[model samples]
Structures are given as C-alpha cells and as structure tokens.
Target: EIPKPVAPAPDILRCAYAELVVTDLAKSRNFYVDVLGLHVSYEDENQIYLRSFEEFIHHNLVLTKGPVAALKAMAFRVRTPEDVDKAEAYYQELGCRTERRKDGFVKGIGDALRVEDPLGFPYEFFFETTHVERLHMRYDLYSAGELVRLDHFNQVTPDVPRGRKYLEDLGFRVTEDIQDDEGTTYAAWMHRKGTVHDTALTGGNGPRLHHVAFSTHEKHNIIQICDKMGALRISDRIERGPGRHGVSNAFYLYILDPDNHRIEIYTQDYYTGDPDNPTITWNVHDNQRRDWWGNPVVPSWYTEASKVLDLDGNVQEIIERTDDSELEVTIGADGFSFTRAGDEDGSYHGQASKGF
Candidate 1:
C-alpha cells in the first residue's frame, strides 16, 4: 500500500504559474511574449506578467528582475480559499518551513501559503487570483506557436522515488516513469490535473528545475516556433526536440530563454483522470524511451538546469546528489550504458546512448 500522508492533502487544482527571476526582463519578455506567443497580462520595469491564450488567471508565468536567473517559486491553485488555510496547516504539521500571507507577494494573488517542502522546493498555494479575459478566440493577437496553457514543471532531484513519494502525499499520482533493472528510479511523471503531468521529477542534483512546459493546440504549432526561431536567426536557442517524447507521448520542442532557463513547447498527451488509468514504465536502455523518433537529448538538457529560490526569494544552495546519478552512471566517463542488450561492443551510439 502507498504510505499515507502525514497531513491531509489540500485540494490543489493545477499548476498556476512559475515566478522566475530573470537577469534581463526585457530580453526574457521578448522571448516569452514575442517569440513563444504568450499573452501579456501586465508588466513594468522590474516584473512582467504573462499568461497563455486559454487561461483566465492573471498570469501563468512571472518574469521578475534579479541579479541572476533562478526560479522564485512554483505556484499552484487550490479549489477554494479554505484550501490555502489547509495548505498552511498541512506543511506546518510536516515540520517544513511555512509562511502564511494575507496579501500575496505577487500581483493579483490574494491569501497564500508558501512552504519549503521535504524535497526543498518552494511551493506556493493560493485560491484567490485576479481573473483576466481569456484570449481563446484572439486570433489577431496570436503568433506562430501560440501557447495555449501552462502544462507542467519539471524538477531535478537526487532521489526520484523519494521526491515522488513526497509529491504523492500531496495528492499527485504517477502516470509514467523511467527505471533501470536495479530498481533505480531515474524519473517520474506525476499529476494533479487530468493531463499526463503537473510536475515531473528527474533524477539528478537536488533542488533544481529541469524545465517548465507550455502547451500548444497542435503539432504544427510546435513546428511554427522552430520556424519562427529559424527565420529570426535564433536557431541556437532551440535546444532539443520537435520530436515526440516516449514518456508523455507529446510532440515537443525545448528552448532556452534569455537566461538559459529551459522551456518546453508541448502538444498532444493523453488524459489520466480515470482512477484505474494504467501507469507506463520505460526501461532506461530503450532509445525510444526518451525520444520516440530516436533523436538524442543534448548533454546540457540532462546536465544543466535552473536554480530555485527559497521562501525569502533568495537562491537556494544546491545539494550534491547522494543517490545514483543517471548521467554519471550512464553517460559520464566513469560508467557506460548500452541501448541494445546484445550490442556489448557499443557500435550504435549517440545522444540516446548517453542516456538522454
């Protein structure tokens, strides 16, 4: 049986927004609002509020000026105002650092609960947010990709199973995962929303962000972002993808923001609201386990990530990985991995063999 939560889980609706500290607000805004085609909720010299085409919330991504690029907090919306109270009590009972604010730190957010969870991620829970006009029908304002919604966030942790268990306690359910024969969990896709993932845990260094993803309507929309980037002579910003992920089974494109913060443009993943929805698992050795089309994931995509902030908005110090590292064992100079079991000589190799 799954271990019960130490405190009753709050009614988290979905991932609301990610407050990211960008070194250059102007550059970041141009990329998110101009290139990716996210709707601008509001903005100022220091902070810029952005939303997706389909969202009614005040913002789905907040770019705040900071000395360095980092994640301020990963915010989630609760079903009701009282759920924020429950969130405060829940994290307090777990002995994690907690704070309750009546006036939210960000624009348009009301009463909120901020907590440093067991896995060291700064989480914000709120029910009240200033709603804006949903731009679902705004074709005149639409750009090439036309991001429709905030899809999910990916985190890097030393221990995938440990991080997954903590999220499960908070009412997230695993939809898919990657593991090796030794029972090492390399990554997991978990969700509170009906979609495949609201958050994902990738085995790596502790307390880092992998990438935050946004959704588009169709596969062509994803290609449009690449085409736009190519036309604008910014193709180097395109990190990896425009391929289907075997994990989420979504067409994807990963790009780096002005500060090297990874962002994923995604489309087409199956629903997982059913109680009996079957979980999918992939063997680490399978080339298609990551990219269904067999394209290799770049080394930086696996090795680099954005730093996260604590409740005080200070950059949190990263903890070294104590658990087995998927990169070190599979791709690093110290260890080796094979895509095919019988191909011990390692004839076929590239990004896939490097454990992307």
Candidate 2:
C-alpha cells in the first residue's frame, strides 16, 4: 500500500517566496520591473526585493547577483511559533546541517532554521515574516503582466523521493504525483497554502533547475505575455505551454529569459485546503506526465538550468543520470508535443523527445 501522509495543520503554514541567483542584478531588476512591472520593495547593491502590485510582503521576489545569479532556494513560513520549535527539533534529529538565526522575530517573523538539503540546495523554515506597504495600483495599460505574487518553483534533483520527503518533513503537501507502475519516479507538486504548488521537484541530480513559475491572476495574462513576446521579436523565447494541464487545470506559458532561464507565467490552480482534495497519481505509461493529454517536454526544459555555486564559490559540476533505461524512459519519452501559443496540437513535442 502507498503510504498516506498526515495532513498539515490547516492554519499552520504561511507563504512561499522564491529567491533567485542571477549573473547581472541590473538586467534582472529591469526585466522584473520594466517588463514584468513589479515594484521595488527594497534593494541594496547586491540584491533587490520586489513585489507584485497585490503583495503586502516586502518582497515576493528576491534576487542576489553574487559570483553568479542562481536560485538560492525557496522559502516557507510555517503557521505558528510552536511549529517552528517542532521543526527545529525534527530537522536536527534527522542529522541535517542546521543554522539558527540569532535574532528571533527580527523582521515580522520569529525563529528559523537555515538548512542545506542533501541535494545541496539552501532552504529556510521560518515562523515570522514582516508585512510591508501594499500598493495595489492600476495595471490597465501601463502594467500588463498581471503578475500577482511569486508562486511555485520547479527544481530538479537526482533523487525525487529524497527531495519530496525533505520538503514534506517541512510541512508541505503534495497535490499531484508522477509515478511508474511499481512506485513513484521523482516528480511532485507540493503546496503550503491555497496555490497549487509552492515548490515542485523533478528527477535530476545535483541542484539543477527546471523552471520557476510565477502566478498570474487571469488565464488571458498568459496569452497576453505570449503575444508581447512575439511583438518584441523575441518569439523564440516562447519555450512551452499556454496549454491546459489535465491534472491542475492551470494554463502555462514557458519562456526563456535573456539568461536562458525558464520562467513560466501561469494561472488557474485552486485551493488544496481540504483533507479530501485527493492526491492524484500518474503512471509512466499514462501519457500525461508533462500534460494531462501527455504533451512532450521540451529538450531545453529537461537539459537546461541556472548554474549553481558550490560552497567553495566554485562552479559545481553535475552528475548525469547513468541508468540508460530509466533516463530513456523519463527524459526521452514520446507521445508528447509542444508549440507556440494557439497551436492546434500541443507544441512542445520534438522528434528526439518522443516516448514511443
């Protein structure tokens, strides 16, 4: 029998915020501010904190242009002070490295842990976060992106089960799962609150990324951005989606930012606040791993990502999956497709990426 998970305390979790490492802070800032229309919440020379018009937090997105800009890790705010203590005890017992913030409740948040996962990604579990001035301004024509908040992130690692378990132990719930006949492979959609996923894990090795998806309020917002990409003569950046997912009913548009980083503009996932929402599962033969209709994943989506910095500040080399059969099944599957927005059949499919 598949082990069922214990439900997280309904009122105990807080928020999901994505932190990115970028090579050029200025370019990233302009892309988010000018193109995406998010306002600056706070900024220093090295990093900038930005927020969507609808956000009250100081920053919905945080960017660090260190030696290189890569995704530092995703953040999760737990529901209460008690849960913070509980998490400290739990993670410490698990023998992972832990760092504690000296000043508790320093900035609208309480105590926390700074942990490096077994996969070498940085993640934080905090009890408190400060609220900032919210400016819900007009976006009629001046601002067209319609981005609301930094939503979920999709990260890749070599081991899916370990990555999924690490996030689950921190109090996240998996909404949907990808599996083979005997067991799950390594992709999961996990959420802390109403949004579909705050963080997603795909099977990969090392700290590679799949893409980071931001939430837009309307489905048309996705199409709007796709059109904008075309008008700018940057239509080649339209990497995948603008198609509906069978499982989540969310519409997605994948694009390549100047850095070749995949950013997805998406909308339409619902609340997972109930115990009975049902955890949906899939099979390798299900023909719907990438999409409910089983759209093919783009080659870039699988092989591309932001470069990560090792603890020594050197570039971390990656380990390619060695099991040919498993790699062939997961990365080179057929029965899929891909296209620019409005393509009759889905547009992500390519001859080399077919599952047959």
Candidate 3:
C-alpha cells in the first residue's frame, strides 16, 4: 500500500516562466534557437525572450548573457492583473525578501517583481502583459512533440517540505508524491496544471536544479529523438530512461544539452489539472518509480546532473546527499537494453534490439 500524503494546499495560479544560465551565451543561444527552434519573442544585448507555438506569456524561455548566472530566476504570471500585490504580501509574511516593481523585469516580458524565498530560491510574479504574434505558421521545420510551450522545471532542493511551503504561500498544489517508507523524505510532483510537474522538489542540500523537461506529442516521438541522436553519433549523452515512470505514467529520456544541462524529452503524463483529480502515491521501494517495467534508477539520474552558476559567476555550492535510492542499473550506458514496441511488460535483451 502507498503512504498517505500530507494535506494538499488550497488552489493557486500556476507558473509562468523559467530562466536558465548558460556558460557560452552565443553557443547556448544558437542551440535553443537553431536546433530546438523556440520562436524569438524579444532580445537585446543582455537577454532574449523566446516563446513556443503554444505560449501566451511574453516569452517562455528567457536567455540572459553574463557572469555568475544559473537560472537567475523563475517567474509566474498570476490570474488577475492585480494579483501581483497578493503575491508580494503572501511571501513577505512567509519571511521572504520580496521586492515590488512598477516596470516590467525583462524588457519584452512586461512588469514584475523579484523575491528571494525563505529557502533562497529567486522567483518573480506578475500579471498583465503585452502579446507577441504566434510564430508556428510562419515556419515549417517543427514536427511532432508539437513542441508546444516551455512546460515545467525540476529542482533538486534541500528541505522538501519547507521549500514547498514557500511555493504554497504563493499558490501551487501537489499532484503526486514520492515517499520513503519511514515518511521522513518526500520528493513531490506539484503543479498548477494537470501535467506531472510544472515544478518539482526532491530533498537535498541547498537549492539545486534537476532537469527541465519539454513536451512532445507522442511517446514514439521520444524514441525517434533517441534514434536521431544515435544517427548523429551523440548517443553517449543520453543519461537515462526512454522508459516509463510509475509515479506519473509518463515516458521520458534525459539527454545533455550542449552545455551539459539536462533536457528531458517527455510526454503522456497523467493529467489531474483540476480540483477533483486524485493525488497519486508510490512506495519508496516500488520498482515502478524509476521504470514501470524495467530496472531501477542508476546513481547518475539521482546523484549526477549538469551544474549551474550563481549570480556572481561562482560555482553554486551544492548540498550533498545523505541517502540515495537503492535502485541501480547500467540501463542507458553503452550497452544493450530492450523494450517492446507496444506492450507494457514486453521487453527483450539489448542484443535483440538494434543499435544498442
């Protein structure tokens, strides 16, 4: 049986935007622009705001160039134009350093304010904004994955419950959770949408990012991406998965961006975006958490991820792990692995599968 979850929070508006720090701005800019193909909503010497075919925010991907940067901040546009004030008052009562602004933060994105939450995660909240033209029909290269909008972000953070409290203060809800048998550690999938995670937190030291996953149209497209990677001789960068997770029933593959940041190609996550959706739970020892019908998670998926920089360009200090999942397997390494094309348990030896 699964463990009972902590009480769910009252409904709140969801996340709006996320920021990423890249070492080589030009190279990073080209990859996101040229390779992945997010539309440029706005840009300047210091930053660029990108939106995908399906986003309404000023920009979904904000690329900033400079020293000491690593995901400078994440922003959420609230429901009403005036909720910005409610956001300021809420986090302030939680003891965070909240700042209010009249002008928009990122030039093309519109007005917003910043805050360092009690746990030290930087966040911005705003409502009301100017709009940009939708760019999908103007281009021809986009394919399956619909490559919609910038979907969600994942953070490896210390004090899961505490950090969650801060997000709850502003408005967010838990859709699913991971629990140790003892119930001391909680890794949760919280969202404003029915999707698996718009934002997630796992227990660790200091606030650290895990991976930022993008949505694809179908699961087969995920496999198609892996096939393309192999054809391109870049398969060595696939960190783990191309398998199912018991928690959300989503298919996933974690690959390294040119900068070593983890970019997940994911889709078909369980939906519970509304109030009546039930919160799902899984046992700590459930083999399904990492893979529904495959082996458990390797150390790298949990312990190793690409690094991020601080505002001062210093390597962000990471908190170490006191415990790790007991699951381990060389699932995605340069070896053989297999999967059935259709059936859930239909899997064979890697030798039986081609291009292993």
Candidate 4:
C-alpha cells in the first residue's frame, strides 16, 4: 500500500510552468520564441515569460538569465489560492524547505509556495494567476509545429521507488513504469492531469531535469518542428525522437535549448482517467520499450541534463546513483537488448543507449 501523508496534500490541477536559468537570455529566446514560437507574455533584459497557444495562464515557461544553467522550479497549479497555504503547511510538516512568495516568484502569478521537496527538486504550487488571451483558434498565429500547452516534466532521481513513493504521498498516481525482472525500478510515470504523466521520475543521479514537454496538435506537428529546426540550421539541437514512444504511445521529438535544457514536442497519448485504468509496466531489456520502432537513444540524452536549483537560486549538489543504470543493462559493459522479452541470444550486444 502506498502510504498517504498525515497532512493532506494540496489539490494540484496540472503541471503549469517550468522556470529555467539560462546563461544567455537572447539565445534562449531565439530557441523558445523564434524557433519554437512560444508566445511571449512578458519579457525583459533578465528574464522572459512564455506560453503555448492554448494556454491562458500568464506563462508556461520562464527563462531567467543566470551565471549557470539550471532548473529553477517546476510549478503546479493547485485547486485554489488556499491550496497554496496547504502546500506550505504540508511540506513544512514533512520537514522539507518551504518558502512563501506573496508577490509570487515570477510575473503575473500571485501567492505561491516553493518547496525543496523530499526528492530535492524545487517545486512550486500556486493558484492565482493573471490570465492572458489564449490563442487557441488563431491558426494564423500557429507555428508549423506549434506547441499547444505544457504537457509534462521528467526529472532524474537516484532512487525510482523512493521518488515514486514520495510523489504518491502528494496525490500522484502511477500510470506506467519500467523495471527489471529482479525488481529493480528504472523509471515511473505518474499523473495528476489524467492523460499519462504530469511528472515522471527517471532513475539517474539526483534532482536534475530530464526534459520539459509541450503538447502539439498531431504527429505532423512534431515533424514540422524537426523541419523548422532543419530550416533554421539548428538540426543539431534535436536529441531524440520524431518517432512513437512505446511507453506513452505519443509521437514525440526532443530538442535542446541554447543552455542545453531539453524540450519535448509531443502528441497523441491515451487517456488514463478511468478509475481502474491498468498501470503499464515495461521490461528494461525490451528494445522497443523506448522507441516503438526500436530506434536507439543517443548517449548524451542519458548522460546530460540541466542541474537543479533551490528556492534561493543556488545550485543543488547532485548525489550519484550507484544502482544499475539503463546503460548498464542495455548498453556499455554486459549490456543487452531484445525486441521481445525472454529471447535468449547469449551473443554479446554492443554499446548504444536504448532510451530513457
């Protein structure tokens, strides 16, 4: 049984926005605004606030110029303004670091509560936001691969089980997960929004952001993003996909920003809203588990990520994971992969990452 916290969790509505620190605000703006075409709700010399076409909130992504690149906060919209207070009390009771921002951390949001969660990720909960004009039906304003809204966030943690359990206490339900036959968990996708995952924990070194995803309208939208990247001569920024993911079944594409923060363009995942929706689990040895077509994951996709920051904007020290990594199972030393599980080809497999 997943233990619930004694203090009730806040009623979180969805994964709202991500605040990232970039060294060059201009380059970050060119990637998100010029290349990706995220609408700028607010901008300045030091920071820029952005939103997707379907978003009515002030922003879905905020890029702040800092000395080093790192994730500032993963923000969630709670049910009400009172829920912000609830978040403060809940995390405080759990002995995590909590900070209250009356003016809010960024522009256009009101009261907010920031917490360095048990898993060491900076998490923000807020309810009050100044709504902007949603450009949903403005087809003329849409980019070739126009991102509609923020879909999810993926984070790296040392222990998948421990991270999943802590997220469960905060009211997230596990929809899918990856694990070995010996009970070693590699990753878990948990949801608050009911599609698939609002946040996912991937087994890796501590508290780093793997990617921030945005939903596109269709599979063609993902292709257009790639096409646009090629036209812009930033094709090198594409890290993974423009293929179907076996886990979410979403057609996806992953690209990097100027500061090396990953952004995912995604569409078409099944709904997990039913009360008894079965949790999907994948075997770590399966080749198609990451890419439905069995495409390989790039090495940098696993080894690289933006470091995370605390509420004070200070970088957090990462504690490395000694647990058997996906690379250890599917690539590198003693690595192996299979199209179907339990296929016994004892012949040695080569060094190439499967996927995260």
By TM-score, who's the top model here? 4
lDDT of 4 by residue, 109-138 (tens): 999999998888999999999999999999
Model 1 bad stretches (over 4 Å): 1-6, 333-356
lDDT score, candidate 1, position 22: 97
Q: What is the lDDT ranking, best to worst?
A: 4, 1, 2, 3
**How well is each residue in 98-161 modelled by candidate 1, as lDDT tens digits?**
9888999799899988888888898899999999998999888877678899999999988888
Please report, in order, the local distance difference test score of every candidate based on alpha carbons: 0.86, 0.65, 0.64, 0.89
On lDDT, the candidate that comes out on top is 4
Q: What is the clash count for each candidate, in the order shown?
A: 0, 26, 9, 0
RMSD of 2: 5.3
Give the C-alpha miss distance for residue 123 in model 1, angstroms.
Answer: 0.5
* Span of ten consecutive residues with least summed lDDT in model 4: 346-355
| Candidate 2 runs further than 4 Å off | 1-15, 103-112, 137-142, 182-184, 292-295, 307-327, 330-356
Give one digit per residue, the lDDT tens place, for model 2 in 247-336: 566888888765666788878878897856688886644445556555655666666776654434455567664322233454454432
Q: Write the per-residue lDDT of candidate 3 for residues 21-60, one digit (tens) a residue.
A: 6667777777677556667787767777777776766777
TM-scores, one per candidate: 0.94, 0.80, 0.80, 0.96
